[PDB]
Amino acid sequence: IGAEHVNNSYECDIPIGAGICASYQTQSIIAYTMSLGAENSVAYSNNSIAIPTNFTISVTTEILPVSMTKTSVDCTMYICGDSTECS
Amino acid sequence: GTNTSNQVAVLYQGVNCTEVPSNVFQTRAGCLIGAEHVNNSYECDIPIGAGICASYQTQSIIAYTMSLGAENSVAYSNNSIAIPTNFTISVTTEILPVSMTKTSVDCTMYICGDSTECSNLLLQYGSFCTQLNRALTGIAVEQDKNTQEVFAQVKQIYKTPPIKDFGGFNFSQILPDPSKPSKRSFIEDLLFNKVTL
Amino acid sequence: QMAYRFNGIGVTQNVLYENQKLIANQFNSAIGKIQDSLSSTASALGKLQDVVNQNAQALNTLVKQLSSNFGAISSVLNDILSRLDPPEAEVQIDRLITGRLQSLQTYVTQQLIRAAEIRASANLAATKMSECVLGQSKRVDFCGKGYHLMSFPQSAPHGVVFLHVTYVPAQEKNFTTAPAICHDGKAHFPREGVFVSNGTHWFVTQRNFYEPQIITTDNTFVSGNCDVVIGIVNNTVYDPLQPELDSFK
Amino acid sequence: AQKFNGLTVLPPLLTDEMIAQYTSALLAGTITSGWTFGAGAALQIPFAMQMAYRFNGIGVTQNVLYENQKLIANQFNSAIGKIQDSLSSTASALGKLQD
Amino acid sequence: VVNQNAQALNTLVKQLSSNFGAISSVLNDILSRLDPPEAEVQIDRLITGR
Amino acid sequence: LQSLQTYVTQQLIRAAEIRASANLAATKMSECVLGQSKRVDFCGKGYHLM
Amino acid sequence: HWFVTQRNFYEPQIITTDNTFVSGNCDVVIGIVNNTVYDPLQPELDSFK
Ligand SMILES: *[C@@H]1O[C@H](CO)[C@@H](O[C@@H]2O[C@H](CO)[C@@H](O)[C@H](O)[C@H]2NC(C)=O)[C@H](O)[C@H]1NC(C)=O
Ligand SMILES: *[C@@H]1O[C@H](CO)[C@@H](O[C@@H]2O[C@H](CO)[C@@H](O)[C@H](O)[C@H]2NC(C)=O)[C@H](O)[C@H]1NC(C)=O
Ligand SMILES: *[C@@H]1O[C@H](CO)[C@@H](O)[C@H](O)[C@H]1NC(C)=O
Ligand SMILES: *[C@@H]1O[C@H](CO)[C@@H](O)[C@H](O)[C@H]1NC(C)=O
Ligand SMILES: *[C@@H]1O[C@H](CO)[C@@H](O)[C@H](O)[C@H]1NC(C)=O
Ligand SMILES: *[C@@H]1O[C@H](CO)[C@@H](O)[C@H](O)[C@H]1NC(C)=O
Ligand SMILES: *[C@@H]1O[C@H](CO)[C@@H](O)[C@H](O)[C@H]1NC(C)=O
Ligand SMILES: *[C@@H]1O[C@H](CO)[C@@H](O)[C@H](O)[C@H]1NC(C)=O
Ligand SMILES: *[C@@H]1O[C@H](CO)[C@@H](O)[C@H](O)[C@H]1NC(C)=O
Ligand SMILES: *[C@@H]1O[C@H](CO)[C@@H](O)[C@H](O)[C@H]1NC(C)=O
Ligand SMILES: *[C@@H]1O[C@H](CO)[C@@H](O)[C@H](O)[C@H]1NC(C)=O
Ligand SMILES: *[C@@H]1O[C@H](CO)[C@@H](O)[C@H](O)[C@H]1NC(C)=O
Ligand SMILES: *[C@@H]1O[C@H](CO)[C@@H](O)[C@H](O)[C@H]1NC(C)=O
């Protein structure tokens, strides 16, 4: 409740489920079916080839974690709190 | 298996079995009864342990030592080579799971089942259920990422051309068929009818 | 494209063109055989069915634990609340709550472990997709047994199915071989392939397919005198320039 | 290990003899046929040519092997002996299994 | 990763304020108000939860 | 029962490490023994032969 | 003197048309040097006399 259903399709902003996603139109919340991507047909033939004539070099960034913070907890102090009888 | 026969064999693990009270065969994994020991060796049908496996002869159950495979000696020489003169192409199938069912469980209805006093007694235990719900949500959300990173590696949706002049190769069994309503391929359709809950 | 892919596995691109019909027929027969083998079940899809069974069985085991007693007089909470006074019902409600909470914690831990296992499998599947489908792998046994050519993906209810197309040699013959040829006191080595003989004459043939050629300066190179090489043989080499020079008369 | 008080250990399916036989078969295959047996039927070939192929794959021409076969064989033999000596010196390289 | 470690640590710290069916969540109050032969039955139920 | 459950959970955790190591060992066997890996530092330092 | 050698092992060869290929004039390449190259066909052409 509170979303408007539309005919169009775009990339998913907020996942809902079963192929439905929601986004902000910029000024109401709309719901739409996901669009998988642009559609085109390649010009296949049995005697045709395509050869590039120019090139561009590009740089991309990828990030990976390697470690996390080292922590230690004293069992007796946490459970009892320097308590003789509790210990 | 019941559909094959009704004869069964019983294995007592780790027992000398002189005190266990037909056929009685001693085995390093404990002796078994109802089986006949044989000289021959075959591939393992049912693993028992310590290199011993059992199978149905076809009308009796036999136990034998495993056979690793056929033995052959290559004709090695210091001036001899072997070169193939013909080739055969083959297709093999490999299957890998990618995701599992997404489930979510609430404490309050499971433990207390809408009882008010149970809910009052439950809240003094702290935040166990916040942790449980967070863990289940974290499990559920990463299932979609697994499907997202395996498929969807192509940016644009390419379509097959109308004419199938592929130099004599026939891809009709794997290309999608527009007539059948789910728009799946023949093999993909055959796959979905074989898995049941 | 087939000509490109044969070149990647160290086989010259020409041999495809004299055997295109045979390769196409073999491919079609292999596809039909995969279809028939998939029709005849041999527990091939067990890797998905077992996962479904372990999820369902764990869930169902979680369900039956709601009927456990855990030391109470009865497992039905409504009976407890409608049969006893609160200050004496509490000493039953607490233990029932503890039992149910422990069961839920165990279920959550098992799901946590299984999720990590499934995610590792999914990472492997994505790596194999990117490796075999969008390119031609060189690492062995990663996209099937034999020399990998291409792969095709198919959908599964909770996974993915790959169809690997590989190149396998079929039948072989054995010959006498030598590491180098000595002519005019100079050693000769092949640019590609090796020297083979049928007992009377020597030839040069491909790595993975028998196709003889006459030994020529074009496909051989010279490096030093031939006394140092162990096992060298004593045969001549042909040079195409001499007949052309003679014909210039 | 020991067994008592309701806990038992189970023998593995494959014994050490079968594992040793598998390793011996793999070693014989890789020293008598190169990489051919991994793809299909094993094809016999002399070892010097196989070393020449493996040299040719790392960007080094195969002619340098035949001109230096004795030196390479001696270096390999010395390296094998050094590896054999190193493990016998009670070095704690086996920590991973012991842990 | 940093947030998911920090939240787990904070939730671990906050669990020390739970009561677990005792008369008080502070152990000093438990051993300062009660005689130990009937105070151990109050201490143990905090110990188990922690 | 709590002690037994803790032991079972610890074994379940360690089994994943053992399986990952076994998968890595199998991959290394297949790539370095049955062929000639062109891949750096996967079958030892330097250019791999056999 | 200039030579041609392998990538990972020193083995100098005489620069020859047989192990080199030609592409474009030498005005665009930065750092090109000024040296001769050998052609093996000339002695054989001289041999026809
Ligand atoms: C190939 O692409 C490059 C850049 O991708 C082209 O170089 C540009 O050409 C335009 C044409 O007017 C200039 O305005 C730019 O200054 C050039 N450089 C850059 C960095 O954009 C080039 O012309 C293309 N064609 C060829 C044959 O190289
Ligand atoms: C190489 O193998 C192919 C098949 O693997 C052979 O082709 C068959 O040859 C037999 C011999 O008469 C024919 O009856 C079949 O019709 C052929 N085709 C098939 C699909 O079986 C071929 O003869 C073998 N030899 C060569 C040199 O190619
Ligand atoms: C989408 O378009 C169809 C006609 O093509 C129309 O009947 C339908 O109402 C549209 N959807 C919405 C939400 O208006
Ligand atoms: C039982 O075994 C027979 C004989 O092998 C086989 O034909 C049949 O398919 C099996 N299953 C059933 C349900 O009969
Ligand atoms: C079983 O017990 C008998 C009698 O004590 C003994 O002789 C025999 O060796 C035992 N079996 C084995 C495998 O040790
Ligand atoms: C198996 O063969 C051995 C001889 O190698 C023989 O002594 C033994 O009796 C045979 N087993 C059976 C069950 O006949
Ligand atoms: C491909 O195979 C199917 C099934 O055998 C057949 O119906 C179809 O005609 C074949 N395609 C061609 C181009 O022959
Ligand atoms: C070729 O292989 C066969 C089969 O092992 C062997 O008998 C023969 O000696 C080998 N050599 C020749 C020249 O036939
Ligand atoms: C070897 O091949 C040549 C090729 O022309 C042929 O003349 C000769 O007879 C062959 N020898 C044998 C022993 O087959
Ligand atoms: C091995 O090669 C040498 C020459 O390199 C030869 O004399 C010898 O006969 C060969 N070995 C056999 C068993 O033929
Ligand atoms: C090889 O042939 C040449 C030709 O004159 C001869 O001088 C030499 O002795 C031969 N060597 C062998 C090992 O047959
Ligand atoms: C770099 O090369 C240029 C010619 O290409 C030369 O003039 C210059 O001296 C070189 N740099 C140094 C530091 O020598
Ligand atoms: C290279 O040599 C040619 C030969 O005459 C000459 O014309 C040219 O100026 C020289 N270039 C340089 C940079 O020395």
The nearest CA of chain B is from the CA of A58 a distance in Å of 18
Binding site membership of B25 for ligand 6 (Cβ less than 6 Å): no
Long-range contacts (CB closer than 8 Å, 24 or more residues apart) made by C86-93: C86/B117, C89/B117, C90/B121, C93/B117, C93/B118, C93/B121
Rounded Cα distance, E30 and E19, in Å: 12
Looking at residue A74, what DSSP letter applies?
-
- Work out the number of other CB atoms within 10 angstroms of the CB of residue C79: 12
Contacts of D60 in chain G (CB under 8 A): 6-9
* C-alpha of B37 from chain center: 30
Distance B62 CA to ligand 6 centre (A): 14
Binding site membership of C199 for ligand 8 (Cβ less than 6 Å): no
The protein residue whose alpha carbon is closest to atom 7 in ligand 8 is: B75
What CA–CA distances, in Å, run from C111 to B65, C97, D48, E41?
39, 21, 55, 35
Contacts of D13 in chain B (CB under 8 A): 44, 47, 49-51
Distance C121 CA to ligand 1 centre (A): 45
Rounded Cα distance, C121 and B98, in Å: 6
The nearest CA of chain D is from the CA of B172 a distance in Å of 29
Rounded Cα distance, G49 and G45, in Å: 8
Amino acid identity at D71: L
Write out chain B in H/E/C secondary structure. CCCCCCCCCEECCCCCCCCCCCCEECCCCCCEECCEECCCCCCCCEEEECCEEEEECCCCEEEEECCCCCCCCCCCCCCEEEEEEEEEEEEEEEEEECCCCCCCCCHHHHHCCCCHHHHHHHHHHCCHHHHHHHHHHHHHHHHHHHHHHHCCCCCCEEECCCCCCCCCCCCCCCCCCCCCCCCCCHHHHHHHCCCCC
Say which residues have a Cβ less than 8 Å from residue B189's Cβ, sequence separation at least 6. B180, B182
Looking at residue G26, what DSSP letter applies?
T
Write down the residue that tokens 């007089």 correspond to. Answer: C73
Distance B86 CA to ligand 7 centre (A): 27
Touching D (3+ Cβ pairs <8 A), the chains are B, C, F, G
Q: Do chains B and C touch (3 or more CB pairs under 8 A)?
A: yes
Q: Do chains E and A touch (3 or more CB pairs under 8 A)?
A: yes
Query: CB B125 to CB E18 under 8 A?
Result: yes
Listed by number, the residues of chain C in 219-248 with a beta carbon closer than 8 Å to a beta carbon of chain G are 241, 245, 248
Query: CB D46 to CB B81 under 8 A?
Result: yes
Binding site membership of C174 for ligand 8 (Cβ less than 6 Å): yes
Q: Is C145 helix (H, G, I), strand (E, B) or coil?
A: coil
Query: CB E47 to CB A80 under 8 A?
Result: yes
Task: Pick the residue from chain G with its C-alpha nearest to D63.
Answer: G11
Experimental approach taken: cryo-EM
Contacts of B29 in chain D (CB under 8 A): 10-11
Looking at residue A40, what DSSP letter applies?
E
Rounded Cα distance, C101 and C110, in Å: 14
Pocket of ligand 9 (CB under 6 A): C 198-201
This structure's resolution (Å) is 3.0
